Amino acid sequence: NDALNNIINNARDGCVPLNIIPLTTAAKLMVVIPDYNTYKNTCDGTTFTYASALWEIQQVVDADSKIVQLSEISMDNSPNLAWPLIVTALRAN
Amino acid sequence: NNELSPVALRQMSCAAGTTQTACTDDNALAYYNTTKGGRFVLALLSDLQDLKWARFPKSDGTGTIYTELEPPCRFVTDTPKGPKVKYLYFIKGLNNLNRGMVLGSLAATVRLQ
Amino acid sequence: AQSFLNRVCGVSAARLTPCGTGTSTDVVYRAFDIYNDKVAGFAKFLKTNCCRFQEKDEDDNLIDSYFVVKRHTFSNYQHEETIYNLLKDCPAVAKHDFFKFRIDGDMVPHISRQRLTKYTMADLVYALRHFDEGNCDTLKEILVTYNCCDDDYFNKKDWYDFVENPDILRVYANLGERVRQALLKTVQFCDAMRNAGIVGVLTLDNQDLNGNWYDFGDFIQTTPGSGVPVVDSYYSLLMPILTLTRALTAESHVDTDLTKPYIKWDLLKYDFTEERLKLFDRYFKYWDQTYHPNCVNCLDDRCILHCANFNVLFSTVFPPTSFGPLVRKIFVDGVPFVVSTGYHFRELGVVHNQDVNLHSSRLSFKELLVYAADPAMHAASGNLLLDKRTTCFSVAALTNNVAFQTVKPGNFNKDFYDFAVSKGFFKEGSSVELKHFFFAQDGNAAISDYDYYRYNLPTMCDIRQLLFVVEVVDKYFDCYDGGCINANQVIVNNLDKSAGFPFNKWGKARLYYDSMSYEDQDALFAYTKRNVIPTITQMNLKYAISAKNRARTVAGVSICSTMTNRQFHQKLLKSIAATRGATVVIGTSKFYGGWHNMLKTVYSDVENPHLMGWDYPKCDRAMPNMLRIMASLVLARKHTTCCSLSHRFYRLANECAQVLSEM
Amino acid sequence: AQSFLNRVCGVSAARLTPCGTGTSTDVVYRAFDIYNDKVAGFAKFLKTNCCRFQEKDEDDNLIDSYFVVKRHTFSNYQHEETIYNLLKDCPAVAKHDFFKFRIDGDMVPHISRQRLTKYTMADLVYALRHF
Amino acid sequence: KMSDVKCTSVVLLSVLQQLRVESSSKLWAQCVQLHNDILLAKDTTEAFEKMVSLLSVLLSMQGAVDINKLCE
Ligand SMILES: [Zn+2]
Ligand SMILES: [Zn+2]
Structure with missing residues (x-):
């Protein structure tokens, strides 16, 4: 993209650590949540924030990789899902 | 509790000067730790203003050591002839321990103002 | 009688009880640091000459501040008198008080210290460096006194364990602030002591747990502004506690003020050199040896250890994203790339590659390898990932969905079982039985075992005793011979194993060991002798019999690492594996009497022999970095003629970045 | 915590003090009379295994009678138990008390002597014979 | 005797796994749990009740036609 070139031009020597490259130029996030509690603390509603930037949820799957609607991520329904949910999101501008 | 100088050292006169050759002979006062591997000197004491080099033959007397020196230390010992300025020359690159040891020996040996 | 208390209370109005x-x-019973001329060491002695008066608070409840009164020689009295008169200013000194008293016919000297504490630093350090859960009572008293935890905690059995009950880390961490105050006050005292022209050795057991010093027993005099305080044993013994208690954790706040937020370091900054120098000056001013923040400039290996230690300490302050490969944008035949040109070690500071060239035309095999093996491209072209199943730092996900690996159960040989029960085995209650099975694992088995690295914590080592034991260990290792070897002398058994990632997509190690002429291999060696090549490591699940149902994993290092580590180490390794009667007994077969010879050798001739053997829990996951680096240096010590000095440092850097802290 | 201090006081006058x-x-530092097989003599040794509680008087002033509590082996516990049961009558014997307590997971033995004195005869004799 | 229970539990888990049960995820977790619990048990009774609870899985499906092999 351009943004990679941007953050490289910003650097005072044109060399930057590796850990921050996907942290600041990625376009897709993937979250792995073990239970419902940890789901509540972070992936809440259809948008959330991580890495000081806003993300919008786009698909949710379970261990077997079968689509799960946000409706049934209840507290009570939770003991009926293969439980390490995998949430893929998109960078919101 | 914890003591810092069980043993001290002895004294020698030797050669020193402003440059490697300006080292003329018998005007230096050396404190020497006579260790396992030969007579190892630590500090130099003189009234000469400043001297950048001392010159002492090796433990086997082959070569005369070329040892650059600290900026001299300023203090005024006394004798029957009143005040007496002397200068203490450390071999540059000396840990705090040897500084402390040499200072203990000297200060306990010689009177100041 | 009570006139004694009335006098000792002096003018500070205390309700002071005897x-x-x-x-x-x-x-x-106190712990001391003794070095007179005849006895020497650091141990628990029996202090006897002190009348100790517990100072009391309002409401007649007790409070931890005490007055301590000593009696000794008159000459000692005048000496402490004059020296305290000299130093009576800097807040680091406890307010003494000199007076005399008569019991019967004895105007006897008496020195009183005001508002001390029950223990000194030496007691804390001794308790933590000589721990035994059978009598760790003084430690308990310190912790409950300073409001770390409260008494009822200590009945929670296994409170002291590390693998078990990890809250002990927080509990210990609560002492950081006080330990820090101690260091700051030591610096202030060293300042005043140099200014007032005083010479004397500083020790641990002369400092209350508030930093206030006391006890000028054998300080001496000199001209003002020319006094050298000695701080070797002090810092050298204190060191481990600094990382055990997370002392410097205050430094990361907005202004060293535990209430304020965290500093916002920017994401792009990675140099961090002057910060390390400034911390070193703020906390260790009078340490008497140079310190290079970037170990590239070190002199011999001992300076490498000396400076890497301080780096281990200071690197626990700065943000964790600013470590790892440093990438940069290079062009080949009009195409932009992203490759790594350096690293940023937690111990060796910053390292820059020497041979880097922008604007290339074509790449031959060697460069194709070293580019495909870097994690730079793989991470820069992947999705961000936030894995909450662990606590280790994530980086990126390569493909769209995470794989879940499972472990199948074993297979049953019914014929042999029927045989063995037919001949009368496996009786109830007998001794021999079935204890070794093929335990199965479910989905999130791999990650649940990789998570076991959380037992690895930064560890600061007592630098002086380490610098001695490294010499002795080296002496245990002077019967062999090592040095580089050309490509045409390596010996590879089973050229048919996996080649790590990503090379395992195109065949086993036979391919790469069979498609690179000797020139390319020697060129690769020569290249890593001047650069750094980070690599990726893959984690594989073992499948074998055992008697404990934890999964087990083994790491598969890429071919770029082994292909060169072999040429660097194989001569010494094979020389070790072919010596008899040594201490290391690798390579000595146990058949044809080998067991007997080994036992006879180890039982050489000790006077009153007993045997003994121990065990390290979590050996490969809990070893701290400093001892791994030390081991690598001891191994490389056999290279005084083949390599030159910068070559040896770059080999150390490569081995670290490849097998110590890589993706 | 204030378990030892209380469940030790037993029943007689809750006026203790650690x-x-x-x-x-x-x-x-006490003086002993020691003849086991290897060492022998009469000298000052360093007694260590006793939690000593100064018993207090009315008006919260101190008084010289102490309770002394020891811990040792269980076999030692039963032994002292049965022997004290045998001899529990003549007024020449100090009223023991046997019980057990747990610090952490340990039901540990504990023997308590009631209303002793600070020193023993051996201390007086030693003081006067080694002045 | 107890060894016989451990052994047949090994064989049963092998059969289940080769009947593709590990494709589903929570079910395989439970089966692995019961198998590893049986392998470490000490007394026969509770091992037997875990054994029946685990066999219920194979019985709940229609891949193995037991009415065939139960011919003796
Ligand atoms: Zn260095
Ligand atoms: Zn070499």
Whole structure:
């Protein structure tokens, strides 16, 4: 993209650590949540924030990789899902 | 509790000067730790203003050591002839321990103002 | 009688109660740091000459501040008198008080210290460096006194364990602030002591747990502004506690003020050199040896260890994203790339590659390898990932969905079982039985075992004793011979194993060991002798019999690492594996009497022999970095002629970045 | 915590005071008469395994009678138990008390002597014969 | 005797796994749990009740036609 070139031009020597490259130029996030509690603390509603930037949820799957609607991520329904949910999101501008 | 100088050292006169050759002979006062591997000197004491080099033959007397020196230390010992300025020359690159040891020996040996 | 208490209370109005009986001294067990001319060491002695008075608070409840009164020689009296008169200014000194008293016909000297503490730093350090859960009572008293945890905690059995009950880390961490104050006050005292022209050795057991010093027993005089305080044993013994208690954790706040937020370091900054120098000056001013923040400039290996230690300490302050490969944008035949040109070690500071070239035309095999093996492209072209199943730092996900690996159960040989029960085995209650099975694992088995690295914590080592034991260990290792070897002398058994990632997509190690002429291999060696090549490591699940149902994993290092580590180490390795009667007994077969010879050799001739053997829990996951680096240096010590000095440092850097802290 | 201090006081006059620091033993210098097989003599040794509680008087002033509590082996416990049961009658014997307590997971033995004195005869004799 | 229970539990888990049960995820977790619990048990009774609870899985499906092999 351009943004990679941007953050490289910003650097005072044109060399930057590796850990921050996907942290600041990625376009897709993937979250792995073990239970419902940890789901509540972070992936809440259809948008959330991580890495000081806003993300919008786009698909949710379970261990077997079968689509799960946000409706049934209840507290009570939770003991009926293969439980390490995998949430893929998109960078919101 | 914890003591810092069980043993001290002895004294020698030797050669020193402003440059490697300006080292003329018998005007230096050396404190020497006579260790396992030969007579190892630590500090130099003189009234000469400043001297950048001392010159002492090796433990086997082959070569005369070329040892650059600290900026001299300023203090005024006394004798029957009143005040007496002397200068203490450390071999540059000396840990705090040897500084402390040499200072203990000297200060306990010689009177100041 | 009570006139003694009335006098000792001096003018600071204390409701002060006596704790030795009437006017006699008291017997206690304290830890000291002794070096006179005849005895020497650091151990628990029996202090005896002190009348100790517990100072009291309002409401007649007790409070931890005490007055301590000593009696000794008159010459000692005048000496402490004059020296305290010299130093009576800097807040780091406890307010003494000199007076005299008569019991019967004895105007006897008496020195009183005001508002001390029950223990000194030496007691804390001794308790933490000589721990035994059978009598760790003084430690318990310190912790409950300073409001770390409260008494009822200590009945929670296994409170002291590390693998078990990890909250002990927080509990210990609560002492950081106080330990820090101690260091700051030591610096202030060293300042005043140089200014007032005083010479004397500083020790641990002369400092209350508030930093206030006391006890000028054998300080001496000199012209003002020319006094050298000695701080070797002090810092050298204190060191481990600094990382055990997370002392410097205050430094990361907005202004070293535990209430304020965290500093916002920017994401792009990675140099961090002057910060390390400034911290070193703020906390260790009078340490008497140079310190290079970037170990590239070190002199011999001992300076490498000396500076890497401080780097281990200071690197626990700065943000964790600013470590790892440093990438940059290079062009080949009009195409932009992203490759790594350096690293940023937690121990060796910053390292820059020497041979880097922008604007290339074509790449031959060697460069194709070293580019495909870097994690730079793989991470820069992947999705961000936030894995909450662990606590280790994530980086990126390569493909769209995470794989879940499972472990199948074993297979049953019914014929042999029927045989063995037919001949009368496996009886109820017998001794021999079935204890070794093929335990199965479910989905999130791999990650649940990789998570076991959380037992690896930064560890600061006592630098002086380490610098001695490294010499002795080296001496255990002077019967062999090592050095580089050309490509045409390596010996590879089973050229048919996996080649790590990503090379395992195109065949086993036979391919790469069979498609690179000797020139390319020697060129690769020569290249890593001047650069750094980070690599990726893959984690594989073992499948074999055992008697404990934890999964087990083994790491598969890429071919770029082994292909060169072999040429660097194989000569010494094979020389070790072919010596008899040594201490290391690798390579000595146990058949044809080998067991007997080994036993006879180890039982050489000790006078009154007993045997003994121990065990390290979590050996490969809990070893701290410093001892791994030390081991690598001891191994490389056999290279005094083949390599030159910068070559040896770059080999150390490569081995670290490849097998110590890589993706 | 104030378990030891209380469940020790037993029943007689809850007017104790630790002259112990906590629930830990105490270090003192006493004179002993020692003949086991290897060492022998009459000298000052360093007794260590006793939690000593200074008993208090009315008006919260101190008084010289102490309770001394020891810990040792279970076999030692039963032995002292049965022998004290045998001899529990003649007024020449100090009223023991046997019980057990747990610090952490340990039902540990504990023997308590009631209303002793600070010193023994051996201390007086030693003081007067080694002046 | 107890060894016989451990052994047949090994064989049963092998059969289940080769009947593709590990494709589903929570079910395989439970089966692995019961198998590893049986392998470490000490007394026969509770091992037997875990054994029946685990066999219920194979019985709940229609891949193995037991009415065939139960011919003796
Ligand atoms: Zn260095
Ligand atoms: Zn070499």
